[PDB]
């Protein structure tokens, strides 16, 4: 890797600089470099890694959705034939997106997950694994679609089982996981009832645990709770 010759601490420092400059591709490349040094990531470093790739693939997904919409319209009755260009460019963006998901999944498999023993790290990495299989599933149309969807579900489920045993209901990682798995159910698995049930139960169990928190922990937990409420309002 092109980051092989750079110090781990230098990579983390530059990832933070790239974040400030809103240079997410750079951020991601720095954090990939840091992961590949082979040491475990701290809490802060895990967050830098997730922020970087979330931003890169988030951009790609938005672009893919624009291009897909254009492509769908082109395949409607009455639409004039414009050639292969829209499909080719959607495919180009898709392939790049898949490439980034494969990279992230690569990092988690080699070897972030197998070394993650604490609940906060293992739940976090398994949530990411769920997420990047979910993005792959968004663009999947072939023989492997079902297996991709199940790979997402399996990762999310393992994260869920750990989170319920080892973390309080207000833990931001536990909350974030539940939020995303609930979206997985709604948007990928065609299970809107499961999506709603999950969001609701997660919200309610968190509400009942807020009394145990400091002001700052309260702020963190309630932020994510409002996102669960936002999704419930969208769906009901």
């Amino acid at each position: 890797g092109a980051m092989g010759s750079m110090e781990r601490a230098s990579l983390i420092q530059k990832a933070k600089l790239a974040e400030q400059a809103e240079r997410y591709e750079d951020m991601a490349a720095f954090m990939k470099g840091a992961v590949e040094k082979g040491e475990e990531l701290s809490c802060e470093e895990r967050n830098l890694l997730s922020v970087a790739y979330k931003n890169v693939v988030g951009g790609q997904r938005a672009a893919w959705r624009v291009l897909s919409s254009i492509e769908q319209k082109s395949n409607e009755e009455g639409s004039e034939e414009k050639g292969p260009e829209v499909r080719e460019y959607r495919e180009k963006v898709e392939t790049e997106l898949q490439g980034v998901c494969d990279t992230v999944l690569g990092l988690l498999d080699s070897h972030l997950i197998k070394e993650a023993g604490d609940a906060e790290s293992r739940v976090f990495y398994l949530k990411m694994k769920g997420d990047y299989y979910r993005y792959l599933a968004e663009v999947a149309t072939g023989d492997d679609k079902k297996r991709i969807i199940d790979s997402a579900r399996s990762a999310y489920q393992e994260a869920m089982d750990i989170s319920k045993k080892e973390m309080p209901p207000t833990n931001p990682i536990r909350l974030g996981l539940a939020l995303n798995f609930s979206v997985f159910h709604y948007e990928i698995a065609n299970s809107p009832e499961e999506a709603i049930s999950l969001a609701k139960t997660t919200f309610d169990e968190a509400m009942a645990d807020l009394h145990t928190l400091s002001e700052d922990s309260y702020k963190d937990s309630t932020l994510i709770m409002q996102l669960l409420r936002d999704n419930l309002t969208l769906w009901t």
Binding site: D131, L179, V183, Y186, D230
Partner: peptide
């Protein structure tokens, strides 16, 4: 689209 983090 729905909220994710």
């Amino acid at each position: 689209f729905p909220a994710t983090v």
